[PDB]
Amino acid sequence: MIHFILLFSRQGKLRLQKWYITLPDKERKKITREIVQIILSRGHRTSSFVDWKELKLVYKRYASLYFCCAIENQDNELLTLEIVHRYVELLDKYFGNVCELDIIFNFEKAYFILDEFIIGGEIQETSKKIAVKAIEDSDMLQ
């Protein structure tokens, strides 16, 4: 499962954060800072895969804001990238032309979508339309 998934901007600002492992607040902040420094101190030809703390630290940002994942060394590396791409596509479909400004304003919506998509670091909605329909139904409830 994904130990922690956090969306951090190029400048270092974090637009999202979702850790599935209970860690101390100071320890979590230190881990996030180290991950940001590693991603911010890594080139574009590093394969987007880093083995930091025995965790598959996969960094793959399609825009100025980057995304990071932390999964155990028990599954294929391409699976994490595919899951990240699927989540990005689902978020773009739910919002519509998702940008950095919209992510900050839609932090609650992004957190709800992430919770409804992956729970506990594992994939919960394999399909892309079912999750979107469920999110829309939950939003329409009020």
């Binding site: 990005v88 998702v98 940008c99």
Partner: peptide, 10 residues
């Protein structure tokens, strides 16, 4: 800016 650009450009 670089923030208003789409994450995937789709």
């Amino acid at each position: 800016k670089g923030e208003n650009t789409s994450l995937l450009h789709p």
